[PDB]
Design a binder for this molecule. Structure first.
Ligand SMILES: C[S@@+](CC[C@H](N)C(=O)[O-])C[C@H]1O[C@@H](n2cnc3c(N)ncnc32)[C@H](O)[C@@H]1O
Ligand SMILES: [Ca+2]
Length: 228
């Protein structure tokens, strides 16, 4: 029964994705409904109760991919359609093409801000969005990896986009690169929330310690803070 609904969503997301690329003018309504489904206790129970390892795992992986691209493409359109304290320095891994949140933090806090994104399109647009929304804020947007960033030791706060598949592989890499007092915020979704997020992982106990795990029954992602 739960299998069916997920198959319907997977088909719809691919259709809405295939479709929105052809014409920017639906998908955003589907995602809102998708959340209501993920956050439903009824379907949280059925999701856990269903233990067909093979067909379940495959369905999560597929929805994880298409929803990640859908969200990624929403920000691309929104961009072209439009077009922590002061001494701290925030690093948002997965800044996106429409970095509105990144802007919000820059204004309220006044901190330095580095955004990285592997998509050259997201970086290219993001920069343009920042130059209109906050040109007089210390906001650097680049396609550099964490290892490439020169002033990586100055970074105090790190946030990860939930929809980054190998976010924990990056977190692993950051230990040696970053200073001793750095704090990391890892967005994730476990259980039924893993169909619109990538899940948490166990960290090397000698490296990263999880000092907080903020679960929210009414929100689409949960948060896990990490220290050294
Ligand atoms: C949907 S967007 C913006 C963040 C979104 N508001 C969220 O909270 O998930 C996520 C971005 O992460 C980027 N991304 C994916 N894998 C990445 C990686 N390994 N390093 C950096 N950015 C990555 C994608 O290009 C995508 O534009
Ligand atoms: Ca400070």
């Amino acid at each position: 029964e739960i299998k069916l609904i997920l198959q319907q969503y997977l088909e719809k997301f691919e259709a809405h994705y295939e479709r929105v690329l052809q014409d920017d003018q639906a998908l955003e309504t589907l995602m809102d409904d998708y959340s209501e489904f993920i956050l439903n206790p009824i379907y949280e129970q059925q999701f856990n109760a269903w233990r067909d390892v093979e067909e379940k795992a495959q369905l999560i992986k597929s929805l994880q991919y298409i929803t990640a691209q859908c969200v990624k493409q929403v920000q691309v359109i929104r961009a072209r359609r439009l077009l922590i304290t002061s001494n701290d320095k925030l690093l948002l891994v997965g800044s996106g093409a429409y970095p509105m949140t990144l802007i919000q933090v820059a204004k309220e806090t006044g901190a330095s801000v580095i955004g990285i994104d592997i998509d050259p399109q997201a970086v290219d647009l993001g920069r343009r969005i920042v130059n209109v929304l906050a040109p007089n804020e210390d906001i650097t947007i680049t396609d550099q990896k964490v290892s490439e960033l020169k002033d990586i030791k100055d970074v105090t706060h790190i946030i990860f986009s939930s929809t980054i598949p190998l976010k924990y592989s990056i977190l692993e890499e950051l230990y040696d690169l970053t200073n001793e007092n750095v704090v990391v915020a890892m967005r994730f979704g476990d259980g039924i929330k893993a169909i619109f997020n990538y899940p948490s992982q166990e960290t090397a106990e000698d490296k990263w310690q999880c000092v907080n795990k903020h679960m929210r029954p009414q929100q689409i992602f949960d948060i896990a803070l990490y220290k050294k």
